[PDB]
Amino acid sequence: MKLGALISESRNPDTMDLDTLSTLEMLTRINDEDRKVPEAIRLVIPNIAQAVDLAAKALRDGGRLIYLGAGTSGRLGVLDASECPPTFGVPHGRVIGLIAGGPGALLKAVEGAEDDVSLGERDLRDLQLTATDMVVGLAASGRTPYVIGALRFARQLGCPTAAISCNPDSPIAQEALVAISPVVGPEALTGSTRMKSGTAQKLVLNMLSTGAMVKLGKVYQNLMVDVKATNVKLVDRACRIVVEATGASRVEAENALSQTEFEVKPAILMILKGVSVEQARLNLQQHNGYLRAAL
Amino acid sequence: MKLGALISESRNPDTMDLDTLSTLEMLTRINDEDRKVPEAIRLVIPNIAQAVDLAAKALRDGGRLIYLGAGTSGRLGVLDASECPPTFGVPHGRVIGLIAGGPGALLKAVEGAEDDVSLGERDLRDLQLTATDMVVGLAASGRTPYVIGALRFARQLGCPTAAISCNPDSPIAQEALVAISPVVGPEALTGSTRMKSGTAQKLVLNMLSTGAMVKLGKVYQNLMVDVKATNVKLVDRACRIVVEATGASRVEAENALSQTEFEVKPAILMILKGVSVEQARLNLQQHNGYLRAAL
């Protein structure tokens, strides 16, 4: 299809007079569109599940999860990736977001960069992509050249790949192993895919990283046991997690966390089993980091 | 309240066994939580409207719209601001997103930066904040020191201010003129405010910038007439907008756009009124840029 025929580029029949509405009305129209996004995602949960299982397999097998997009799509990938080290304790190189135009594009849009198919390939080669790594290409339109080129390169190397787009049967969906295609409909402002489509992309990325990290043992119950606590709020949360999980005083909790360099998993073990920091770390290694299995 | 008592830090009773669920189940739990976000935003539309009207007033009166947050909240402000120049044609300095820790924080989290109340003030002073500028502070928790300090500084200068938080009666809501407080409930992963709270923040920022820019005349009907077209997709959209708005051939459209340096508003006028580029630009200046008023 040509660009002008895409659903993402179509006019929304419920906002044709957007600029003549009162502020309240206009905002209610936008919110009516936002209401559509969680259902669009619900319909593609099976595909997202396939992608979560591939991502978990990739990270377990020593690879990385790499998000790639231009503009908004690229910034959303960087947004999700940036949250993985503080939330799940992984090194920053484990989950990576790439954006067309490089770091400057994080702060100021450079819309021309998206047109180069070879740039997506170049950015992946610059990270020394391997067949174990998983690559997720994001483009609301489903046709951004930067993303097409990146996915083609990853596919030929043997990487598991996923494509997130909001138009059906898109070029990027055709290139990828797993297609995640939440159809959100025409945007309130015609072609403004930063809106519903961007929201959908965010929901999918949060599902991918959270789903994979939970499968990898980086959570316990619904508690953030692999938090990397480097500020007041996070260290306070680390203390509260230990108390929530052991049923022991925050004091025994604080003394154990101090010894573990604020690492929650070994602190919980120390308290529940009455073992040393050193013994707790070895026990967790024996169980591949899964606290449930160590308890 | 203490941190551990906040709704954002509370356990979600529907995800207590998150780590024992099948991938499909886990994803359905996350999506059930996402479903809650558009309704939480709907309940605070009146407050968002107040903020849209203040932002429009600020930009009309020659000021800027400045978003400020740490971590995810900060990256979301930069995400929304980055989209304003290509979508609404404004200079990049008109809508600005600030993040604790500076540009490095856009790519790699530096969670310790959020604890300094004086850093928020410093970042605003570095932009030469004036009383006409509007400052929007974002913190899911509602208590991030960087944001508290920033809002205090803006308030004392006489700036209109808004606070976006997901906990009720928060410190930042108390400091600001307008409080936007969508209560989304406990996160699927306890304390993981990048999830629902982050989604809420995104929806609110998109409402603020879109709402204000529509009020300022940067849209016509539901068409992106102030698009800054610097790539294939955007220039193609510019052509399609002219055809959609004039009922003239894409050819007359392409010739007019070439003459206007791909600026849609004057091209539409040229075609509908049969005037020169020069005459079209003057007519738009006489009508303060509002295409409807010039037609």
Side-chain angles (χ1 to χ4, degrees), chain A residues 9 11 19 23 53 72 80 83 190 194 199 202 221-222 244 292, chain B residues 9 11 19 23 53 72 80 83 190 194 199 202 221-222 237 244 292:
Chain A
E9 296 289 330
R11 296 185 70 179
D19 63 338
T23 303
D53 292 343
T72 295
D80 191 78
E83 295 154 344
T190 309
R194 73 193 197 102
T199 300
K202 178 183 179 298
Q221 303 181 58
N222 57 8
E244 185 66 8
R292 279 186 187 266
Chain B
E9 296 289 330
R11 296 185 70 179
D19 63 338
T23 303
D53 292 343
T72 295
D80 191 78
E83 295 154 344
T190 309
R194 73 193 197 102
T199 300
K202 178 183 179 298
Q221 303 181 58
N222 57 8
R237 190 184 294 158
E244 185 66 8
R292 279 186 187 266

PDB file of all heavy atoms in Angstrom, chain A residues 9 11 19 23 53 72 80 83 190 194 199 202 221-222 244 292, chain B residues 9 11 19 23 53 72 80 83 190 194 199 202 221-222 237 244 292:
ATOM      1  N   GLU A   9      -2.558   6.816   8.692  1.00  0.00           N
ATOM      2  CA  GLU A   9      -2.633   8.097   7.980  1.00  0.00           C
ATOM      3  C   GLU A   9      -4.048   8.549   7.662  1.00  0.00           C
ATOM      4  O   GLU A   9      -4.244   9.579   7.023  1.00  0.00           O
ATOM      5  CB  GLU A   9      -1.819   8.035   6.672  1.00  0.00           C
ATOM      6  CG  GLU A   9      -0.340   7.829   6.900  1.00  0.00           C
ATOM      7  CD  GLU A   9       0.375   9.035   7.490  1.00  0.00           C
ATOM      8  OE1 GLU A   9       0.001  10.214   7.265  1.00  0.00           O
ATOM      9  OE2 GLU A   9       1.339   8.803   8.209  1.00  0.00           O
ATOM     10  N   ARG A  11      -8.065   9.802   8.348  1.00  0.00           N
ATOM     11  CA  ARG A  11      -8.747  10.801   9.193  1.00  0.00           C
ATOM     12  C   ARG A  11      -9.706  10.099  10.118  1.00  0.00           C
ATOM     13  O   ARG A  11     -10.398   9.175   9.715  1.00  0.00           O
ATOM     14  CB  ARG A  11      -9.492  11.836   8.357  1.00  0.00           C
ATOM     15  CG  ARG A  11      -8.550  12.674   7.495  1.00  0.00           C
ATOM     16  CD  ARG A  11      -9.273  13.781   6.765  1.00  0.00           C
ATOM     17  NE  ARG A  11      -9.729  14.828   7.685  1.00  0.00           N
ATOM     18  CZ  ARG A  11     -10.372  15.937   7.326  1.00  0.00           C
ATOM     19  NH1 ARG A  11     -10.698  16.148   6.056  1.00  0.00           N
ATOM     20  NH2 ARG A  11     -10.715  16.817   8.250  1.00  0.00           N
ATOM     21  N   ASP A  19     -10.402  21.354  15.856  1.00  0.00           N
ATOM     22  CA  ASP A  19      -9.991  22.739  16.146  1.00  0.00           C
ATOM     23  C   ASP A  19     -11.088  23.738  16.485  1.00  0.00           C
ATOM     24  O   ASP A  19     -10.766  24.872  16.871  1.00  0.00           O
ATOM     25  CB  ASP A  19      -9.119  23.322  15.017  1.00  0.00           C
ATOM     26  CG  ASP A  19      -9.854  23.414  13.704  1.00  0.00           C
ATOM     27  OD1 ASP A  19     -10.843  22.683  13.516  1.00  0.00           O
ATOM     28  OD2 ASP A  19      -9.418  24.181  12.837  1.00  0.00           O
ATOM     29  N   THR A  23     -12.049  23.407  24.901  1.00  0.00           N
ATOM     30  CA  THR A  23     -10.950  22.613  25.446  1.00  0.00           C
ATOM     31  C   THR A  23     -11.460  21.313  26.073  1.00  0.00           C
ATOM     32  O   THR A  23     -10.907  20.230  25.862  1.00  0.00           O
ATOM     33  CB  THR A  23     -10.182  23.410  26.496  1.00  0.00           C
ATOM     34  OG1 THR A  23      -9.705  24.634  25.912  1.00  0.00           O
ATOM     35  CG2 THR A  23      -9.037  22.607  27.059  1.00  0.00           C
ATOM     36  N   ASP A  53       8.633 -15.129  25.256  1.00  0.00           N
ATOM     37  CA  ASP A  53       9.331 -16.397  25.400  1.00  0.00           C
ATOM     38  C   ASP A  53      10.638 -16.388  24.594  1.00  0.00           C
ATOM     39  O   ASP A  53      11.655 -16.872  25.077  1.00  0.00           O
ATOM     40  CB  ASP A  53       8.396 -17.564  25.053  1.00  0.00           C
ATOM     41  CG  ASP A  53       7.246 -17.747  26.087  1.00  0.00           C
ATOM     42  OD1 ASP A  53       7.322 -17.227  27.218  1.00  0.00           O
ATOM     43  OD2 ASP A  53       6.285 -18.479  25.762  1.00  0.00           O
ATOM     44  N   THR A  72       9.801   8.915  17.665  1.00  0.00           N
ATOM     45  CA  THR A  72       9.037   8.485  18.840  1.00  0.00           C
ATOM     46  C   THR A  72       9.239   7.001  19.128  1.00  0.00           C
ATOM     47  O   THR A  72       9.495   6.608  20.268  1.00  0.00           O
ATOM     48  CB  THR A  72       7.532   8.744  18.648  1.00  0.00           C
ATOM     49  OG1 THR A  72       7.317  10.158  18.573  1.00  0.00           O
ATOM     50  CG2 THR A  72       6.704   8.152  19.730  1.00  0.00           C
ATOM     51  N   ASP A  80      12.082   2.225  27.582  1.00  0.00           N
ATOM     52  CA  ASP A  80      11.917   0.936  28.238  1.00  0.00           C
ATOM     53  C   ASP A  80      13.256   0.348  28.647  1.00  0.00           C
ATOM     54  O   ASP A  80      13.413  -0.141  29.772  1.00  0.00           O
ATOM     55  CB  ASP A  80      11.151  -0.031  27.332  1.00  0.00           C
ATOM     56  CG  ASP A  80      10.727  -1.297  28.058  1.00  0.00           C
ATOM     57  OD1 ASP A  80       9.740  -1.263  28.822  1.00  0.00           O
ATOM     58  OD2 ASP A  80      11.412  -2.315  27.891  1.00  0.00           O
ATOM     59  N   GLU A  83      15.034   1.672  31.916  1.00  0.00           N
ATOM     60  CA  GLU A  83      14.426   1.268  33.178  1.00  0.00           C
ATOM     61  C   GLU A  83      14.841  -0.129  33.602  1.00  0.00           C
ATOM     62  O   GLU A  83      14.616  -0.540  34.748  1.00  0.00           O
ATOM     63  CB  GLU A  83      12.885   1.318  32.997  1.00  0.00           C
ATOM     64  CG  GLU A  83      12.312   2.745  32.745  1.00  0.00           C
ATOM     65  CD  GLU A  83      10.962   2.858  31.973  1.00  0.00           C
ATOM     66  OE1 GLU A  83      10.488   1.934  31.320  1.00  0.00           O
ATOM     67  OE2 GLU A  83      10.348   3.951  32.035  1.00  0.00           O
ATOM     68  N   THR A 190      -4.772  13.730  12.575  1.00  0.00           N
ATOM     69  CA  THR A 190      -4.448  12.826  11.484  1.00  0.00           C
ATOM     70  C   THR A 190      -2.946  12.604  11.295  1.00  0.00           C
ATOM     71  O   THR A 190      -2.180  13.551  11.076  1.00  0.00           O
ATOM     72  CB  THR A 190      -5.102  13.291  10.173  1.00  0.00           C
ATOM     73  OG1 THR A 190      -6.511  13.526  10.378  1.00  0.00           O
ATOM     74  CG2 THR A 190      -4.892  12.262   9.039  1.00  0.00           C
ATOM     75  N   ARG A 194       2.395   9.525  17.325  1.00  0.00           N
ATOM     76  CA  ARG A 194       2.961   9.628  18.663  1.00  0.00           C
ATOM     77  C   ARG A 194       1.882   9.390  19.714  1.00  0.00           C
ATOM     78  O   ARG A 194       2.221   9.130  20.873  1.00  0.00           O
ATOM     79  CB  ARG A 194       3.566  11.019  18.889  1.00  0.00           C
ATOM     80  CG  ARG A 194       2.520  12.117  19.064  1.00  0.00           C
ATOM     81  CD  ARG A 194       3.132  13.497  18.970  1.00  0.00           C
ATOM     82  NE  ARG A 194       2.242  14.553  19.523  1.00  0.00           N
ATOM     83  CZ  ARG A 194       2.363  15.126  20.709  1.00  0.00           C
ATOM     84  NH1 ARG A 194       3.377  14.844  21.517  1.00  0.00           N
ATOM     85  NH2 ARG A 194       1.472  16.024  21.091  1.00  0.00           N
ATOM     86  N   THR A 199       1.363   5.077  22.432  1.00  0.00           N
ATOM     87  CA  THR A 199       0.903   4.456  23.675  1.00  0.00           C
ATOM     88  C   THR A 199       0.937   2.930  23.528  1.00  0.00           C
ATOM     89  O   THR A 199       1.396   2.205  24.436  1.00  0.00           O
ATOM     90  CB  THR A 199      -0.501   4.974  24.068  1.00  0.00           C
ATOM     91  OG1 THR A 199      -0.439   6.413  24.247  1.00  0.00           O
ATOM     92  CG2 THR A 199      -1.008   4.313  25.308  1.00  0.00           C
ATOM     93  N   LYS A 202       4.452   1.630  23.825  1.00  0.00           N
ATOM     94  CA  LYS A 202       4.905   1.641  25.194  1.00  0.00           C
ATOM     95  C   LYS A 202       4.343   0.433  25.937  1.00  0.00           C
ATOM     96  O   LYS A 202       5.087  -0.241  26.681  1.00  0.00           O
ATOM     97  CB  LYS A 202       4.477   2.929  25.927  1.00  0.00           C
ATOM     98  CG  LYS A 202       4.911   2.945  27.394  1.00  0.00           C
ATOM     99  CD  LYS A 202       4.422   4.192  28.128  1.00  0.00           C
ATOM    100  CE  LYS A 202       4.848   4.196  29.600  1.00  0.00           C
ATOM    101  NZ  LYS A 202       4.299   3.083  30.398  1.00  0.00           N
ATOM    102  N   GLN A 221       7.323 -13.110  43.704  1.00  0.00           N
ATOM    103  CA  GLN A 221       5.915 -12.759  43.918  1.00  0.00           C
ATOM    104  C   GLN A 221       5.714 -11.575  42.954  1.00  0.00           C
ATOM    105  O   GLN A 221       5.990 -11.705  41.743  1.00  0.00           O
ATOM    106  CB  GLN A 221       5.601 -12.404  45.369  1.00  0.00           C
ATOM    107  CG  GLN A 221       5.948 -13.478  46.403  1.00  0.00           C
ATOM    108  CD  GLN A 221       5.571 -13.021  47.795  1.00  0.00           C
ATOM    109  OE1 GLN A 221       4.411 -12.699  48.061  1.00  0.00           O
ATOM    110  NE2 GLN A 221       6.539 -13.039  48.711  1.00  0.00           N
ATOM    111  N   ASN A 222       5.175 -10.458  43.450  1.00  0.00           N
ATOM    112  CA  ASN A 222       5.087  -9.205  42.655  1.00  0.00           C
ATOM    113  C   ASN A 222       6.019  -8.134  43.249  1.00  0.00           C
ATOM    114  O   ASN A 222       5.746  -6.926  43.200  1.00  0.00           O
ATOM    115  CB  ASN A 222       3.661  -8.690  42.508  1.00  0.00           C
ATOM    116  CG  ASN A 222       2.960  -8.452  43.830  1.00  0.00           C
ATOM    117  OD1 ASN A 222       3.556  -8.522  44.890  1.00  0.00           O
ATOM    118  ND2 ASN A 222       1.683  -8.147  43.754  1.00  0.00           N
ATOM    119  N   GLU A 244       8.703  -7.284  53.736  1.00  0.00           N
ATOM    120  CA  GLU A 244       7.505  -7.933  53.157  1.00  0.00           C
ATOM    121  C   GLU A 244       7.681  -9.426  52.912  1.00  0.00           C
ATOM    122  O   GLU A 244       6.734 -10.227  53.131  1.00  0.00           O
ATOM    123  CB  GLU A 244       7.096  -7.208  51.853  1.00  0.00           C
ATOM    124  CG  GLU A 244       5.808  -7.718  51.233  1.00  0.00           C
ATOM    125  CD  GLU A 244       4.555  -7.448  52.083  1.00  0.00           C
ATOM    126  OE1 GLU A 244       4.588  -6.728  53.104  1.00  0.00           O
ATOM    127  OE2 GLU A 244       3.486  -7.965  51.725  1.00  0.00           O
ATOM    128  N   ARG A 292      12.767 -18.386  44.579  1.00  0.00           N
ATOM    129  CA  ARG A 292      11.824 -19.428  44.982  1.00  0.00           C
ATOM    130  C   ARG A 292      12.460 -20.785  45.103  1.00  0.00           C
ATOM    131  O   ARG A 292      12.144 -21.546  46.019  1.00  0.00           O
ATOM    132  CB  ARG A 292      10.657 -19.588  44.011  1.00  0.00           C
ATOM    133  CG  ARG A 292       9.594 -18.576  44.216  1.00  0.00           C
ATOM    134  CD  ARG A 292       8.413 -18.876  43.320  1.00  0.00           C
ATOM    135  NE  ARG A 292       7.488 -17.781  43.443  1.00  0.00           N
ATOM    136  CZ  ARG A 292       6.459 -17.729  44.276  1.00  0.00           C
ATOM    137  NH1 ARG A 292       6.167 -18.754  45.080  1.00  0.00           N
ATOM    138  NH2 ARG A 292       5.676 -16.656  44.265  1.00  0.00           N
TER     139      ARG A 292
ATOM    140  N   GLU B   9       3.332   2.646  45.882  1.00  0.00           N
ATOM    141  CA  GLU B   9       4.223   1.656  46.497  1.00  0.00           C
ATOM    142  C   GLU B   9       3.506   0.444  47.068  1.00  0.00           C
ATOM    143  O   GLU B   9       4.134  -0.432  47.655  1.00  0.00           O
ATOM    144  CB  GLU B   9       5.070   2.309  47.608  1.00  0.00           C
ATOM    145  CG  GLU B   9       6.007   3.375  47.094  1.00  0.00           C
ATOM    146  CD  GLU B   9       7.176   2.841  46.280  1.00  0.00           C
ATOM    147  OE1 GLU B   9       7.677   1.707  46.491  1.00  0.00           O
ATOM    148  OE2 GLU B   9       7.608   3.569  45.396  1.00  0.00           O
ATOM    149  N   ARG B  11       1.121  -3.088  47.140  1.00  0.00           N
ATOM    150  CA  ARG B  11       1.055  -4.353  46.383  1.00  0.00           C
ATOM    151  C   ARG B  11      -0.298  -4.474  45.732  1.00  0.00           C
ATOM    152  O   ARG B  11      -1.312  -4.158  46.338  1.00  0.00           O
ATOM    153  CB  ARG B  11       1.313  -5.561  47.277  1.00  0.00           C
ATOM    154  CG  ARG B  11       2.725  -5.562  47.860  1.00  0.00           C
ATOM    155  CD  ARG B  11       3.023  -6.820  48.640  1.00  0.00           C
ATOM    156  NE  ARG B  11       3.142  -7.987  47.760  1.00  0.00           N
ATOM    157  CZ  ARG B  11       3.425  -9.224  48.162  1.00  0.00           C
ATOM    158  NH1 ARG B  11       3.575  -9.497  49.453  1.00  0.00           N
ATOM    159  NH2 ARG B  11       3.524 -10.191  47.267  1.00  0.00           N
ATOM    160  N   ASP B  19       5.012 -14.087  39.448  1.00  0.00           N
ATOM    161  CA  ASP B  19       6.126 -14.928  38.977  1.00  0.00           C
ATOM    162  C   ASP B  19       5.853 -16.415  38.800  1.00  0.00           C
ATOM    163  O   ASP B  19       6.724 -17.125  38.273  1.00  0.00           O
ATOM    164  CB  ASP B  19       7.382 -14.754  39.854  1.00  0.00           C
ATOM    165  CG  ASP B  19       7.158 -15.187  41.281  1.00  0.00           C
ATOM    166  OD1 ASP B  19       5.996 -15.222  41.724  1.00  0.00           O
ATOM    167  OD2 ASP B  19       8.145 -15.448  41.979  1.00  0.00           O
ATOM    168  N   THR B  23       3.175 -17.380  30.815  1.00  0.00           N
ATOM    169  CA  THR B  23       3.393 -16.117  30.115  1.00  0.00           C
ATOM    170  C   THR B  23       2.068 -15.471  29.705  1.00  0.00           C
ATOM    171  O   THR B  23       1.852 -14.267  29.876  1.00  0.00           O
ATOM    172  CB  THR B  23       4.252 -16.335  28.871  1.00  0.00           C
ATOM    173  OG1 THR B  23       5.496 -16.946  29.252  1.00  0.00           O
ATOM    174  CG2 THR B  23       4.496 -15.037  28.144  1.00  0.00           C
ATOM    175  N   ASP B  53      -5.379  25.475  29.024  1.00  0.00           N
ATOM    176  CA  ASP B  53      -5.675  26.886  28.832  1.00  0.00           C
ATOM    177  C   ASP B  53      -4.517  27.754  29.346  1.00  0.00           C
ATOM    178  O   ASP B  53      -4.154  28.730  28.700  1.00  0.00           O
ATOM    179  CB  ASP B  53      -7.034  27.235  29.451  1.00  0.00           C
ATOM    180  CG  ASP B  53      -8.230  26.584  28.694  1.00  0.00           C
ATOM    181  OD1 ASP B  53      -8.083  26.142  27.537  1.00  0.00           O
ATOM    182  OD2 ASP B  53      -9.343  26.577  29.265  1.00  0.00           O
ATOM    183  N   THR B  72      12.087   8.066  34.407  1.00  0.00           N
ATOM    184  CA  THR B  72      10.999   7.837  33.451  1.00  0.00           C
ATOM    185  C   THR B  72      10.165   9.095  33.238  1.00  0.00           C
ATOM    186  O   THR B  72       9.876   9.477  32.103  1.00  0.00           O
ATOM    187  CB  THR B  72      10.067   6.709  33.932  1.00  0.00           C
ATOM    188  OG1 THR B  72      10.804   5.481  33.945  1.00  0.00           O
ATOM    189  CG2 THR B  72       8.849   6.573  33.093  1.00  0.00           C
ATOM    190  N   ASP B  80       7.569  13.959  24.755  1.00  0.00           N
ATOM    191  CA  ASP B  80       6.503  14.810  24.245  1.00  0.00           C
ATOM    192  C   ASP B  80       7.061  16.073  23.611  1.00  0.00           C
ATOM    193  O   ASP B  80       6.640  16.469  22.517  1.00  0.00           O
ATOM    194  CB  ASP B  80       5.511  15.150  25.360  1.00  0.00           C
ATOM    195  CG  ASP B  80       4.251  15.818  24.833  1.00  0.00           C
ATOM    196  OD1 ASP B  80       3.370  15.118  24.290  1.00  0.00           O
ATOM    197  OD2 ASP B  80       4.166  17.049  24.929  1.00  0.00           O
ATOM    198  N   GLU B  83       8.547  15.911  19.956  1.00  0.00           N
ATOM    199  CA  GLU B  83       7.574  15.753  18.881  1.00  0.00           C
ATOM    200  C   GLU B  83       6.927  17.067  18.484  1.00  0.00           C
ATOM    201  O   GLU B  83       6.263  17.161  17.444  1.00  0.00           O
ATOM    202  CB  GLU B  83       6.483  14.765  19.374  1.00  0.00           C
ATOM    203  CG  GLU B  83       6.994  13.316  19.633  1.00  0.00           C
ATOM    204  CD  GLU B  83       6.209  12.443  20.658  1.00  0.00           C
ATOM    205  OE1 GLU B  83       5.410  12.913  21.462  1.00  0.00           O
ATOM    206  OE2 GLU B  83       6.415  11.204  20.644  1.00  0.00           O
ATOM    207  N   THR B 190       5.175  -4.400  42.043  1.00  0.00           N
ATOM    208  CA  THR B 190       5.081  -3.414  43.107  1.00  0.00           C
ATOM    209  C   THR B 190       6.113  -2.289  42.995  1.00  0.00           C
ATOM    210  O   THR B 190       7.326  -2.532  42.980  1.00  0.00           O
ATOM    211  CB  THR B 190       5.151  -4.087  44.486  1.00  0.00           C
ATOM    212  OG1 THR B 190       4.194  -5.165  44.562  1.00  0.00           O
ATOM    213  CG2 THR B 190       4.902  -3.072  45.625  1.00  0.00           C
ATOM    214  N   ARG B 194       6.961   2.993  36.232  1.00  0.00           N
ATOM    215  CA  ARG B 194       7.173   3.167  34.801  1.00  0.00           C
ATOM    216  C   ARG B 194       5.994   2.602  34.018  1.00  0.00           C
ATOM    217  O   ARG B 194       5.846   2.929  32.837  1.00  0.00           O
ATOM    218  CB  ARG B 194       8.450   2.447  34.353  1.00  0.00           C
ATOM    219  CG  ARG B 194       8.311   0.926  34.318  1.00  0.00           C
ATOM    220  CD  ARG B 194       9.654   0.242  34.181  1.00  0.00           C
ATOM    221  NE  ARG B 194       9.527  -1.175  33.748  1.00  0.00           N
ATOM    222  CZ  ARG B 194       9.730  -1.633  32.523  1.00  0.00           C
ATOM    223  NH1 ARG B 194      10.150  -0.840  31.546  1.00  0.00           N
ATOM    224  NH2 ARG B 194       9.540  -2.915  32.270  1.00  0.00           N
ATOM    225  N   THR B 199       2.346   5.431  31.794  1.00  0.00           N
ATOM    226  CA  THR B 199       1.354   5.534  30.723  1.00  0.00           C
ATOM    227  C   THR B 199       0.457   6.753  30.972  1.00  0.00           C
ATOM    228  O   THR B 199       0.162   7.536  30.045  1.00  0.00           O
ATOM    229  CB  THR B 199       0.539   4.226  30.592  1.00  0.00           C
ATOM    230  OG1 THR B 199       1.446   3.132  30.298  1.00  0.00           O
ATOM    231  CG2 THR B 199      -0.514   4.331  29.538  1.00  0.00           C
ATOM    232  N   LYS B 202       2.231   9.937  30.048  1.00  0.00           N
ATOM    233  CA  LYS B 202       2.295  10.110  28.618  1.00  0.00           C
ATOM    234  C   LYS B 202       0.964  10.644  28.100  1.00  0.00           C
ATOM    235  O   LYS B 202       0.948  11.577  27.269  1.00  0.00           O
ATOM    236  CB  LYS B 202       2.624   8.786  27.897  1.00  0.00           C
ATOM    237  CG  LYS B 202       2.657   8.937  26.375  1.00  0.00           C
ATOM    238  CD  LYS B 202       2.915   7.607  25.668  1.00  0.00           C
ATOM    239  CE  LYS B 202       2.932   7.761  24.144  1.00  0.00           C
ATOM    240  NZ  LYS B 202       1.658   8.225  23.562  1.00  0.00           N
ATOM    241  N   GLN B 221      -8.937  21.723  11.153  1.00  0.00           N
ATOM    242  CA  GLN B 221      -9.822  20.555  11.210  1.00  0.00           C
ATOM    243  C   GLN B 221      -9.034  19.580  12.104  1.00  0.00           C
ATOM    244  O   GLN B 221      -8.656  19.942  13.238  1.00  0.00           O
ATOM    245  CB  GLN B 221     -10.138  19.975   9.834  1.00  0.00           C
ATOM    246  CG  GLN B 221     -10.762  20.951   8.833  1.00  0.00           C
ATOM    247  CD  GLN B 221     -11.050  20.257   7.519  1.00  0.00           C
ATOM    248  OE1 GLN B 221     -11.778  19.263   7.477  1.00  0.00           O
ATOM    249  NE2 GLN B 221     -10.523  20.807   6.426  1.00  0.00           N
ATOM    250  N   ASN B 222      -8.846  18.338  11.651  1.00  0.00           N
ATOM    251  CA  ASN B 222      -7.965  17.368  12.351  1.00  0.00           C
ATOM    252  C   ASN B 222      -6.717  17.072  11.499  1.00  0.00           C
ATOM    253  O   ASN B 222      -6.159  15.966  11.514  1.00  0.00           O
ATOM    254  CB  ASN B 222      -8.687  16.088  12.753  1.00  0.00           C
ATOM    255  CG  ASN B 222      -9.341  15.366  11.591  1.00  0.00           C
ATOM    256  OD1 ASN B 222      -9.156  15.714  10.438  1.00  0.00           O
ATOM    257  ND2 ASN B 222     -10.096  14.338  11.908  1.00  0.00           N
ATOM    258  N   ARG B 237       2.806  13.529   3.497  1.00  0.00           N
ATOM    259  CA  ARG B 237       1.644  13.942   4.302  1.00  0.00           C
ATOM    260  C   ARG B 237       1.280  15.395   4.017  1.00  0.00           C
ATOM    261  O   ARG B 237       0.113  15.726   3.857  1.00  0.00           O
ATOM    262  CB  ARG B 237       1.928  13.742   5.783  1.00  0.00           C
ATOM    263  CG  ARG B 237       0.658  13.921   6.625  1.00  0.00           C
ATOM    264  CD  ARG B 237       0.940  13.826   8.099  1.00  0.00           C
ATOM    265  NE  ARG B 237       1.373  12.484   8.442  1.00  0.00           N
ATOM    266  CZ  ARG B 237       2.078  12.191   9.529  1.00  0.00           C
ATOM    267  NH1 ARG B 237       2.471  13.149  10.366  1.00  0.00           N
ATOM    268  NH2 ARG B 237       2.457  10.939   9.742  1.00  0.00           N
ATOM    269  N   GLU B 244      -6.343  17.311   0.650  1.00  0.00           N
ATOM    270  CA  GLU B 244      -7.531  17.110   1.511  1.00  0.00           C
ATOM    271  C   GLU B 244      -8.279  18.399   1.824  1.00  0.00           C
ATOM    272  O   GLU B 244      -9.538  18.415   1.867  1.00  0.00           O
ATOM    273  CB  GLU B 244      -7.116  16.388   2.815  1.00  0.00           C
ATOM    274  CG  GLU B 244      -8.275  16.026   3.725  1.00  0.00           C
ATOM    275  CD  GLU B 244      -9.226  14.971   3.136  1.00  0.00           C
ATOM    276  OE1 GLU B 244      -8.964  14.357   2.080  1.00  0.00           O
ATOM    277  OE2 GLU B 244     -10.281  14.733   3.745  1.00  0.00           O
ATOM    278  N   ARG B 292      -8.312  29.159   9.559  1.00  0.00           N
ATOM    279  CA  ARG B 292      -9.756  29.352   9.438  1.00  0.00           C
ATOM    280  C   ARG B 292     -10.149  30.795   9.289  1.00  0.00           C
ATOM    281  O   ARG B 292     -11.052  31.121   8.517  1.00  0.00           O
ATOM    282  CB  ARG B 292     -10.533  28.819  10.639  1.00  0.00           C
ATOM    283  CG  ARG B 292     -10.745  27.353  10.586  1.00  0.00           C
ATOM    284  CD  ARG B 292     -11.635  26.916  11.727  1.00  0.00           C
ATOM    285  NE  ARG B 292     -11.674  25.477  11.718  1.00  0.00           N
ATOM    286  CZ  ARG B 292     -12.589  24.733  11.115  1.00  0.00           C
ATOM    287  NH1 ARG B 292     -13.616  25.289  10.468  1.00  0.00           N
ATOM    288  NH2 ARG B 292     -12.507  23.411  11.210  1.00  0.00           N
TER     289      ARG B 292
END
